[PDB]
Amino acid sequence: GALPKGLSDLIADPTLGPQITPDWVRTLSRIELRGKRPRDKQDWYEIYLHLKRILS
Amino acid sequence: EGALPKGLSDLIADPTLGPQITPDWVRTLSRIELRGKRPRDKQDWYEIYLHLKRILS
């Protein structure tokens, strides 16, 4: 896959994944700081929930 | 849309909060958007920055 591994993990999670739309995957996939990214699926979900409240 | 969100420009120009945002952070934050929608005002950007900085160490 071409997504960060923790994000691919989140999308494959059968309870947490299905709610995350393709637009959100794209938004999340662009988050990086000199290649450092949220490291695991919990990190990605944590930022997703907070961003969703700002941007949805 | 502008490369640098206007609310993030406001954050960077803010004398109390602006100093904390390195140029790399500016460019990282500038890429956060959902279908062209971005965070609005300087405080919204700072709220995001604080949380994301803690996540990314």
SS (H, E, C) chain A: CCCCHHHHHHHHCCCCCCCCCHHHHHHHHCCCECCECCCCHHHHHHHHHHHHHHHC
* Contact assessment for residue A25 and residue A7, using Cβ atoms and an 8 Å cutoff: yes
User: What is the experimental resolution, given in Å to one decimal place?
Assistant: 1.4
Maximum alpha-carbon separation in chain A: 31
- Mutate which of B24, B34, B48 to disrupt the A interface (most A C-beta within 10 Å)? B34
Nearest CA to CA, how far is B46 from chain A (Å)?
12
Give the closest residue to B55 by CA, choosing from A13, A45, A52.
A45
Experimental method: X-ray
